[PDB]
Amino acid sequence: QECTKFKVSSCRECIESGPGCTWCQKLNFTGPGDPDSIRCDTRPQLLMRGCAADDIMDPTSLAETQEDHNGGQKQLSPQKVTLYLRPGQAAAFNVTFRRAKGYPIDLYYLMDLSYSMLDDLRNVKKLGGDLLRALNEITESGRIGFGSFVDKTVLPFVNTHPDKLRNPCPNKEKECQPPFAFRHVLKLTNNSNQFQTEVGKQLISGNLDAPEGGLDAMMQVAACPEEIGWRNVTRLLVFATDDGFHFAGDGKLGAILTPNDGRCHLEDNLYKRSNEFDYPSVGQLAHKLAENNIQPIFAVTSRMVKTYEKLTEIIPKSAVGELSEDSSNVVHLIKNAYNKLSSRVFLDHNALPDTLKVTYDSFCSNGVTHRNQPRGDCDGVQINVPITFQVKVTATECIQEQSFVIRALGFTDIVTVQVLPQCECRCRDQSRDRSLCHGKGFLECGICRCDTGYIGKNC
Amino acid sequence: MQVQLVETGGGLVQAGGSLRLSCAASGNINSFNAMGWFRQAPGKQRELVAAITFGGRTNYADSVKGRFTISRDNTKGSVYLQMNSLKPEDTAVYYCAASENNLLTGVWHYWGRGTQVTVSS
Amino acid sequence: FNLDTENAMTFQENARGFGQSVVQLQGSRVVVGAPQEIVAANQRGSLYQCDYSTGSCEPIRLQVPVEAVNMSLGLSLAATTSPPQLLACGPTVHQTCSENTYVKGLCFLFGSNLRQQPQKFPEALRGCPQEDSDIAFLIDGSGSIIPHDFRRMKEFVSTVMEQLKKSKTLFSLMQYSEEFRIHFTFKEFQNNPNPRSLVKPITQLLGRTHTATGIRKVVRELFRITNGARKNAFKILVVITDGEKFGDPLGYEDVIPEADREGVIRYVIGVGDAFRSEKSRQELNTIASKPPRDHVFQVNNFEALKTIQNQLREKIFAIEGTQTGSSSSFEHEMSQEGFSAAITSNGPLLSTVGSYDWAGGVFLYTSKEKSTFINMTRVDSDMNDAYLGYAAAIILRNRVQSLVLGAPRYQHIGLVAMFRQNTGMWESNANVKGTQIGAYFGASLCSVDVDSNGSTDLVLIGAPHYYEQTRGGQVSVCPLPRGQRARWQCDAVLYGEQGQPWGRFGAALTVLGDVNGDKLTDVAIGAPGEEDNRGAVYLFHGTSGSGISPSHSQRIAGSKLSPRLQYFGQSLSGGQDLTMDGLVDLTVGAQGHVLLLRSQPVLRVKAIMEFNPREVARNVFECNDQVVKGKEAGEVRVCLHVQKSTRDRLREGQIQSVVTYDLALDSGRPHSRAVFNETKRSTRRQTQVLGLTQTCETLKLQLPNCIEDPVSPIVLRLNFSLVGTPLSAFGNLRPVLAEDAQRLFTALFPF
Ligand SMILES: *[C@@H]1O[C@H](CO)[C@@H](O[C@@H]2O[C@H](CO)[C@@H](O)[C@H](O)[C@H]2NC(C)=O)[C@H](O)[C@H]1NC(C)=O
Ligand SMILES: *[C@@H]1O[C@H](CO)[C@@H](O[C@@H]2O[C@H](CO)[C@@H](O)[C@H](O)[C@H]2NC(C)=O)[C@H](O)[C@H]1NC(C)=O
Ligand SMILES: *[C@@H]1O[C@H](CO)[C@@H](O[C@@H]2O[C@H](CO)[C@@H](O)[C@H](O)[C@H]2NC(C)=O)[C@H](O)[C@H]1NC(C)=O
Ligand SMILES: *[C@@H]1O[C@H](CO)[C@@H](O[C@@H]2O[C@H](CO)[C@@H](O)[C@H](O)[C@H]2NC(C)=O)[C@H](O)[C@H]1NC(C)=O
Ligand SMILES: *[C@@H]1O[C@H](CO)[C@@H](O)[C@H](O)[C@H]1NC(C)=O
Ligand SMILES: [Ca+2]
Ligand SMILES: [Ca+2]
């Protein structure tokens, strides 16, 4: 390869000078008596000049596998990797993903109850076991829940006049509910009969502006796992609406300037604290969804499809489906959304320092081969079909010891990757009375280093 | 359009005496505008002696000026004829007429059946 | 890089919202709004005046109208330095009409002083929309109207009454001839709401066309509360005439002014061949309300009355609402005027974010009697819910002013458009869209004149909710087009420091002018969400070439200033001197706290190292083998000049500074070829207090005679460190050496 040397006083400084630099530690190799920086060079220049690869010091970057041994086979292996990184040399280790049989699906159906969703509300009340039956078709022990949402209860998001706070619907309607931010209606249950009675009591509502506070409700679903009752396995959040959504900064119009804190504020299963906090941002919600492993399914109407399709870049584990303006849409769209979510696997890492660089090569079953990618990306993933992701990690300096995790998005599995440096030539300890050059120093890979003796020999 | 006219007030009266004729219209006040009184003496045709618009403009024949007064009350759908200083030459069958239109000399389709006024010398 | 952090002056008061809007006044004062302070019931928001000398803030007198209820005054602010003015807006006035409330805006244009009550903008609040409509008809019954056409006119009235009775409508009709004929009142329509039942038995009048007196009896007798007209209702009269007034004792000069004092809006349907002449059509224009084109149309015969009734339904609906149907598109109502404010030279502007179902719009009260309302060209559902006007800024094109607007919600992606006027017509010059969904691109706008040409070179667009892993906001560098008709294209992008993904970089932007004395305008960008909402402010220098430097020069964190700071950088205002020190000050807003950062004068150091014995002379290489010591004279001259890179109105005679000399001879070799007079090694360190005049010091070097043969010249390196002594006046304000100042200097002495 290539090696450049300047002002090299040690074996360590030689290895730091480039990934192609090697060091011979032969005694009295400096025949002319000239500077000892000549000792650092490439392997073939030194190998022809009297070194035979044992005298050559060449530390190389390494990957170690310490996979946990247990009965069965987890869906992501190896589980622990140790890397010794030399600056300029990449370490490669290869990670395998094997889709399991799926898990008991938790579907929380968070529904718009604006007046344009009136005919949608009648059908969703009567869906009941059909939602559970579709969940029980893919995986066993499915479990369903319900929530509802209108915008925040201040101007201009709703009409705050007391006559219209009582009936926000059009004046001829009198099966109408007052406006509300978020109501948790049904805790997650396999009992379709409690779904029918509790959703059946919910009345349609109305608001003033077209965008609504659905993202504010999605934050409360993700920030209140005990009230929603999220089992860890296959968290899914159906988001049905026919309008746009407010997001952070919109609350300034209602003089609401405190940012969303990401906390749970369900009191009496109502987000009565919506007037106190602003709407969340997209990235704020996307962070909380990835922590709690909740994958949204956006069931929006046709005029909103291309708008919510843009969210899939910021929320990687999300899906968009067309709603039929009466919720007569097939739960096959909800079923196909889960199939699109399950065919897409993303392999990514957390925040890294500027010293470390990570690439992923993605080998996929019917999803083609990718290389040098910022994140792993495979499509067409099938159950019990292994796929393989090649991680290459490169350090640009002698890094301090550190660890980071690689996680498959949509899943709780983690590959813990500990990174250690490889800059020491690991030379043999001398510091002995027999090994004293002119009475001072020690051998130190063939360099007699001065013991702060100032004027003298080899100093 | 259906309008029916009935005369109320006719009878026998002495010369120099007085008599008031009245008539109600059996229909919509919006369905007729101008009203008038005709009289038919023996041997003669029907003579318009007093007519009134809906707003109260009047016209009188010269033979009855200073003696007869036509007046109306639109709240009762009625028009009136106060006949003072009656003469034997005023003996006639008097008709009320009404028009769908508001002219004093045109289209008197609606007619009462008339009432007899006889003035004795 | 020269904003004083240690000697910062913090203002504080207990009022909810204090720090949510700051603006530098000219005369050493900072006006801050506290939009959520409940000074009294049915009032919200107040304003305070903070002076640099008196370290406390004082409230501002509030001339609030009675129905400016829950106003949140102080949310938006703007001021002009050259004419002393202050524009304070509360854009949440609540008008609780019966069955609806509305959120509108109200502003105040103060002058040089504050006990003078300002010019109210708008002077009149837009008001309660009138409730329910009283529609009267006035139909010609002249003998000119033939009987078949008269029933066509009756059928016209019946169908229009059938079409206009959506809900809560009262109707009346009066024929008009020689005499005038009340067929049914509003009360009679309310008891029998069947138009055909009321219209069919009507018979035609005949005679002279007394149009003027008929209008008078409509205003007096027909529009009368004893006949069922409702107070504060819409009063509409539709006159159907043959258009030739004859025989009426009254002219149009009499009855039309009394029709207008009662507020009766007049529509005229002109029927027949009478109006083929233009003179007769002008008489129709006399009857109707202005403009005549909306209120007058001509039909060739009574069978053509059917043609106008299709459009007349839309025209009469238009008063209640134009093409509205259900889910009404609210226009100039729900507007929240003054949500963003700015003061154009011609007049104060204020944005109506909630105009045309929150599509956004901007008022321009140049004289207040004319209101120049400005949104974009295309009218579609795409523009709905855009919140345009949420950041409003002005640009200067050769000292002629134009306008830029921000719509952070255009299809849930941000949008910024420019407007210029063309002979009184404000048209959209260009537009720039965002790319990150939910980034709120265009929430903050900032026009930058780098060279101070009078020509704005650059518009800073902020996307504070842009989420890019560690980063938590973005500012787009978007230069104005030169005029080649190229679409407006953003050349660069400014990020914040990595590590705060929810930092909201770009939420508030300001121009502070030249702080470092480089003749180029510098900018500041606030990130009030960094360090878990303990915000920070970044400073970016201007660049030659009319750009902004991609890397910031000074990051001022709100944690270091005070532990109890929060949202440091939510409001920014710079460009003026507040301390009268000639130093461009900068005010920052936080939650409950407003603090001003003073600019430090910049100094640069010039080092000259000159030797008269720069000649080698090479006498020393003839040593007579005696004991070798450093011999011969060592004349040296080391002058340091420190000068000001900044112009201030200080006296400039009190600029003291302390500098530390470090000198080294033949560095980089194991033993040097020279030593000094005193130390007997190759090292020197001197401290010396220096003014702005050149202080020069001669030294003595020592050269041993016989040394290595002359190959390499002797070098004398100098690294230094400058600490400016603080001023006795001006609040102990410390001069600071420039960031890019060269701090190493090498001297040449040949061998
Ligand atoms: C990842 O697994 C692949 C096999 O699927 C390994 O790649 C092969 O490496 C050998 C060298 O040992 C080459 O000859 C082949 O051409 C490679 N094949 C492909 C498809 O890349 C690779 O070594 C593994 N990565 C590791 C261990 O880091
Ligand atoms: C803004 O107007 C509203 C009107 O609803 C006020 O809010 C409520 O006012 C009633 C008055 O009887 C109180 O009983 C409630 O307690 C108020 N609500 C709350 C949450 O306190 C409100 O006070 C007005 N704001 C100001 C500043 O006057
Ligand atoms: C921009 O401003 C214009 C004029 O102020 C708006 O035009 C009005 O549009 C409504 C649509 O409902 C019509 O009913 C009105 O008759 C129009 N007024 C006119 C032409 O004077 C326009 O809607 C505004 N908004 C957009 C997005 O263009
Ligand atoms: C001149 O340069 C020298 C060399 O860098 C500076 O000495 C350093 O000082 C710092 C502060 O004490 C130490 O952390 C370094 O270890 C020192 N390095 C060496 C090689 O001594 C010195 O501070 C500089 N002086 C001035 C006035 O700039
Ligand atoms: C299913 O429902 C029954 C009651 O209907 C409940 O007792 C049981 O725990 C539920 N099981 C699961 C796996 O949800
Ligand atoms: Ca500058
Ligand atoms: Ca100053």
Numbering used by the authors:
A (entry chain B): 1 to 459
B (entry chain C): 1 to 121
C (entry chain A): 1 to 751
Q: What did the published study say regarding this structure?
A:
The integrin receptor αMβ2 mediates phagocytosis of complement-opsonized objects, adhesion to the extracellular matrix, and transendothelial migration of leukocytes. Integrin αMβ2, also known as complement receptor 3, CD11b/CD18, and macrophage-1 antigen (Mac-1), participates in all three types of interactions. The ectodomain is divided into a HP consisting of the N-terminal domains, and the tailpiece consisting of the membrane-proximal C-terminal domains. αMβ2 contains a von Willebrand factor type A domain, known as the αI domain, in the α-chain. Nbs are single domain antibodies of typically 120 residues derived from the variable domain of heavy chain–only antibodies present in members of the Camelidae family.
Here, we present the first atomic structure of the human αMβ2 headpiece fragment in complex with the nanobody (Nb) hCD11bNb1 at a resolution of 3.2 Å. We show that the receptor headpiece adopts the closed conformation expected to exhibit low ligand affinity. The overall conformation of the αMβ2 HP is closed with the hybrid, PSI, and I-EGF1 domain in the β2 subunit located toward the αM thigh domain, in contrast to the open conformation of the β2 subunit known from a structure of ligand-bound αIIβ3 integrin. In the αM β-propeller, two calcium ions organize coordinating loop regions that together with the first residue of αM forms the interface with the thigh domain. In contrast, the metal ion–binding sites in both the αI and βI domains are empty, and the internal ligand region at the C-terminal end of the αI α7 helix is not interacting with the βI MIDAS site. In the Nb complex, the αM Phe302–Glu320 region is in a helical conformation meaning that this region adopts the closed conformation that prevents Glu320 from interacting with the βI MIDAS. Furthermore, we found the Nb binds to the αI domain of the αM subunit in an Mg2+-independent manner with low nanomolar affinity. The epitope of the Nb comprises two distinct regions in the αI domain. Interestingly, a comparison of the αI–CD11bNb1 and the αI–C3d complexes revealed a small, but significant, overlap between the Nb and C3d suggesting that their binding is mutually exclusive. The crystal structure indicates that in the R77H αM variant, associated with systemic lupus erythematosus, the modified allosteric relationship between ligand binding and integrin outside–inside signaling is due to subtle conformational effects transmitted over a distance of 40 Å.
